[PDB]
Amino acid sequence: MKRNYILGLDIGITSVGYGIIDYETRDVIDAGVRLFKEANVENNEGRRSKRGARRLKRRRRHRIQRVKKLLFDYNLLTDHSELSGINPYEARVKGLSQKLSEEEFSAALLHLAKRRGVHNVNEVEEDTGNELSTKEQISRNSKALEEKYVAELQLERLKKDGEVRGSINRFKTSDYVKEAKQLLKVQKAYHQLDQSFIDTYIDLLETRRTYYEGPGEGSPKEIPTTLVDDFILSPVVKRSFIQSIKVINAIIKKYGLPNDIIIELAREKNSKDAQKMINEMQKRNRQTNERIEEIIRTTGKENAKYLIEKIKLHDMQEGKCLYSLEAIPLEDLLNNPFNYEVDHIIPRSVSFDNSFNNKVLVKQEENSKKGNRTPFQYLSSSDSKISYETFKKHILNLAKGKGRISKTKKEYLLEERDINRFSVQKDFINRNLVDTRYATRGLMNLLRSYFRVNNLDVKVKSINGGFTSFLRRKWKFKKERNKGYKHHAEDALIIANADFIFKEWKKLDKAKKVMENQMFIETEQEYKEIFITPHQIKHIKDFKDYKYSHRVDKKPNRKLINDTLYSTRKDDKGNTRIVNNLNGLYDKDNDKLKKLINKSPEKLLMYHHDPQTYQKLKLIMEQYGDEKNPLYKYYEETGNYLTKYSKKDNGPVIKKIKYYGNKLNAHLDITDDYPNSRNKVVKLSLKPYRFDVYLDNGVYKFVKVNNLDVIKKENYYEVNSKCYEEAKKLKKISNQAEFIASFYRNDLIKINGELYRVIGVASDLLNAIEVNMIDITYREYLENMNDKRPPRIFKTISSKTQSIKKYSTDILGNLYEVKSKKHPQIIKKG
RNA sequence: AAAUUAGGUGCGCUUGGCGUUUUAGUACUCUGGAAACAGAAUCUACUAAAACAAGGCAAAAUGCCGUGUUUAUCUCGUCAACUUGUUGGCGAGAU
DNA sequence: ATTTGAATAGGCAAGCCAAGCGCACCTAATTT
DNA sequence: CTTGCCTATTCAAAT
């Protein structure tokens, strides 16, 4: 509308805050938040890594099948050939001297092609007992094969150590080719095979694609978002800049073109990096707090808690005034704090820097004499007690070694340039007011370009991440995630009011112009007065009508299910159950088995099936009951792993134990991949696409549509009709039932008059849906209350449920009760 | 703006050993037998073969795709798509 | 008066890591 | 760290 305004933006990892304020009065017009999932690099790294793995496995399978065809052609393999009980390690070692049978020969060649070593690993010739190192293993093996073939070494381990496969099974392809050439040299005599056979086979065995070959044949008005794709960014940042642009486009359409935009990109790059910094900061804070506590313990002076900054500076400065180099006794500082003042190294009026790096603890008299001068200017004047040269030496000494000063502080202390030069002031302004990061520069260049071309008088600006926090401290406005997502929005409104301060104060005109990248304060009290409490912060703080817009995901063909495979079993009561496994039996702090034996001995399969080994294990648990892991003591004291019961003490070690786990309900059945499987083979965690609510004779009901239920066709996805009608039948949804709505992740749902956002279907069977709150996470809602419930909301949809309505927000967070189509969606072109 | 050295961020490609699971064999257990061995059990271990996001192509091939990005809703107009009455683009409106 | 079913609280588990390559753009230092 | 989903515990309604 006609009225002119400013647009604040607080860009973040998961959020874009926005604030809109009247250009004349500085009253709040509007304010809201646009929330999204952080775009993690892990996600695509996953997709790529799995695409790599799928090709590796495809190519192994295809190599084995190319070998078979060659054996069919030279009439060494048939449809009706028994390869079943032929140990290929025996057949490899035998065939380097004597005649193999056609079957042994086929067994051997097929075993080689399956597993054929690395081709791109050179000797390190070093051994630091690293099991997982390929280079160290390849080398250890190269030494073992000085006089023998791979199959000779492999058969030796099979007989001595009882096993072959594992980490030590890492050999060079050239070591394998040396064997194959010999095998084929011997066997060429007795079998009819020619140099064409031998050449073909070794090619199959040794050959692979290069990085520069890659796959085979088939393989693949308003501000635009395509310009973000041009200049390269972190995915986390790249998402936010696309979100931000669409939030600017929506504000422009509604309210018209802003006079001024001003932007703040968050400090942190991702949540983890932030956590690390926070941890580092907390680590730093703890040290200061411990010292403060020590001071209070030793001196009894409680006022130390109010002199944190002075004490920090005191310790930093070895208890000396940096201008006079006279001692600041800690006791005197505590008793007479007014004798010592915190001074800005570079006058705040020039640098706009209020950071700890621009602060020093000095005597009140020295502070008065320095005035609005740098240490260099002051110490070069007739007013100083010491020479600049003496000062400089001291600072340089402080910078080298223990009790160090930051680089930035050192530079400020040793600033010799003329403060009064525009170029120097520009440098300070750019450092303190204007954000200097490749992304932030990239964004404002995108925007400024856009407005320039289309001839729209819009002043894009930026402010430093730190700066907002200063104003919060200044105007007594405590930041806290506690409250909810609103903090992001009330950051935006602050940013927007800083713009008002950098327009109404003619004394900030230079700073304003610098921030607008346009081509070209005498006292501390004056500086302080410019930024004083407006009254309009009461408006910001007391404001209520915030708006939230969570983004809704409708993408088909996301992760369908979990990777892991599970066997099943029918128990005594005739309930199919997942089989679990206890691994890591001989670990110091592992109480899993000891807990299981005391609670539920009948859950072990060996309880039923190997009673003698069970009784043998129980005597150990009784022997070393007092410890966490009885088996650890068994291994420590005797020096021998637990073996299966046997009459002659020749049973194998026990390394995993299978026991009956949860009952089987919601699963994916993969048992047809395993011909003649006695039990059932399954996968778990059917991941949801959406759920479709129906109103049936006054009863609310719903169907879960799984991602498994959605199938790619030519250029579109289709919800499977048979799976869908089957699903309705298990839910007993009539043919005369009205479709109400479909709910995707983060879709908004009003259940019995209470609005939430959808997470998913907790239990299809019990008819429960997991939701979350809108303005705050339910976790945090409980924390601020100090409640100790589980931090998850579940809602049952039942005969008791009275109304279900779907809502929707625009990108700005304007809320709408929305209409639905008459039927569910089946086709999805996007 | 270029060069040199060191690191980073990202996209993509090529491999290797494993891991999970089934079937078989062998060892372990039980029964019978002078013994070879036959049967029972499917528990613990090794070896082989096979499957590993559900699937979809392709057809002797160093064969190919399947977990990312973009994504408020509904109506009307228009262009298109294949699924032939729906859902994509563009425009307009409402929520 | 006791037993059966709904709702809420409590809790578990989720494929991995080592070798190589290209290209892209950024930063820092130094010189022009 | 979040989510799909099972188990166990506690209270009210029905035989």
CA dist A9 and A261 (Å) reads: 8
Residue for token pair 């109480």: A591
User: For residue A643, which phi and psi values (nearest 5 degrees)?
Assistant: -110, 150
CA dist A323 and A325 (Å) reads: 6
> How many angstroms is C1' of B40 away from CA of A646?
18
CA dist A672 and A29 (Å) reads: 63
Check if the beta carbon of residue A248 is closer than 8 Å to that of residue A225.
no
The nucleotide minimizing the C1' distance to residue A43's CA is B68
Q: Which nucleotides in chain D lie less than 7 Å from some protein C-beta?
A: 1-7
DSSP labels, A546-585:
-EEEE--B--SSS--S-S--EEEEE-TTS-EEEEEEE---
Check if the beta carbon of residue A264 is closer than 8 Å to that of residue A493.
no
Active site (annotated) includes residue A119:
no
Check if the beta carbon of residue A71 is closer than 8 Å to that of residue A49.
no
Q: Say whether the CB atom of A135 is under 7 angstroms from strand C.
A: yes
> How many angstroms is C1' of B41 away from CA of A567?
19
DSSP state of A320: B
For the beta carbon of residue A783, count every other beta carbon within 10 angstroms. Answer: 15
Residue A268 marked in a binding site: yes
Sorted by sequence, the CB contacts under 8 Å of residue A311 that are 6+ apart come out as A288, A291, A292, A295, A304, A330, A333
User: For residue A271, which phi and psi values (nearest 5 degrees)?
Assistant: -60, -35
Orientation of helix A438-454 relative to helix A235-255, angle to 10°: 30
Side chain identity, residue A267: R
Residue A566 marked in a binding site: yes
CA dist A303 and A360 (Å) reads: 20
> How many angstroms is C1' of B81 away from CA of A738?
29
Query: Closest protein residue to B22 using CA and C1' atoms?
Result: A674
CA dist A566 and A580 (Å) reads: 8
Query: Closest protein residue to B73 using CA and C1' atoms?
Result: A818
For residue A523, give Cα distances in angstroms to A224, A371, A376, A511.
46, 9, 19, 17
The two tokens of residue A762 are: 């907790």
> How many angstroms is C1' of B16 away from CA of A144?
19
DSSP state of A237: H
Check if the beta carbon of residue A369 is closer than 8 Å to that of residue A383.
yes
Question: What sign does the dihedral A163-A165-A166-A167 (CA atoms) show?
Answer: positive
Q: A41-57 burial, b if ≥16 CB within 10 A, otherwise e?
A: eeeeeeeeeeeeeeeee
Check if the beta carbon of residue A354 is closer than 8 Å to that of residue A343.
no
Q: A295-313 burial, b if ≥16 CB within 10 A, otherwise e?
A: beeeeeeeebeebeebbbb
> How many angstroms is C1' of B22 away from CA of A575?
21
Sorted by sequence, the CB contacts under 8 Å of residue A119 that are 6+ apart come out as A172, A173, A174, A206, A208
Give, in degrees to the nearest 5, the angle at Cα A315 between A311 and A317.
Answer: 115
Helical spans, DSSP H, in A231-270: 235-255
The nucleotide minimizing the C1' distance to residue A132's CA is C18
Residue for token pair 């020749």: A650
What was the elucidation method?
Answer: cryo-EM
Active site (annotated) includes residue A10:
yes
Long-range contacts: A524-532, Cβ < 8 Å, 24+? A524/A347, A524/A348, A524/A349, A524/A372, A526/A349, A527/A348, A527/A349, A530/A501, A530/A505, A531/A471, A531/A474, A531/A501
CA dist A402 and A540 (Å) reads: 45
Annotated catalytic residue, options A111, A344, A550, A667:
A344
The two tokens of residue A306 are: 């109010």
Q: Say whether the CB atom of A563 is under 7 angstroms from strand C.
A: yes
> How many angstroms is C1' of B4 away from CA of A345?
38
DSSP state of A5: E
The two tokens of residue A63 are: 């190599």
Residue among A12, A8, A11 at smallest CA distance from A274? A12
Q: Which nucleotides in chain C lie less than 7 Å from some protein C-beta?
A: 7-11, 13-22, 24-27
Measured in whole angstroms, the distance separating CA A407 from the mean position of its chain's CA atoms is 32
> How many angstroms is C1' of D11 away from CA of A771?
25
When computed from its CA atoms, the radius of gyration of chain A, rounded to whole angstroms, is: 37
The nucleotide minimizing the C1' distance to residue A122's CA is C19
The two tokens of residue A116 are: 């054929």
Q: What is the experimental resolution, given in Å to one decimal place?
A: 2.9
Q: Which nucleotides in chain B lie less than 7 Å from some protein C-beta?
A: 9-25, 27-30, 41-55, 57, 60-75, 81-83, 86-89, 91, 95
Annotated catalytic residue, options A10, A260, A435, A764:
A10
Residue among A591, A592, A474, A455 at smallest CA distance from A529? A474
- As a whole number of angstroms, the longest Cα–Cα distance in chain A is 108
Residue among A704, A731, A723 at smallest CA distance from A798? A731
> How many angstroms is C1' of D13 away from CA of A451?
70
Three-class SS of A29-98: EEEEEEECCCCCHHHHHHHHHHHHHHHHHHHHHHHHHHHHHHHHHCCCCCCCCCCCCCCHHHHHHHHCCC
Residue A488 marked in a binding site: yes
Check if the beta carbon of residue A240 is closer than 8 Å to that of residue A11.
yes
The two tokens of residue A658 are: 């299978």
Query: Closest protein residue to C24 using CA and C1' atoms?
Result: A232
Q: A201-224 burial, b if ≥16 CB within 10 A, otherwise e?
A: beebbeeeeeeeeeeeeeeeeebe
Residue A394 marked in a binding site: no
Q: Say whether the CB atom of A506 is under 7 angstroms from strand C.
A: no
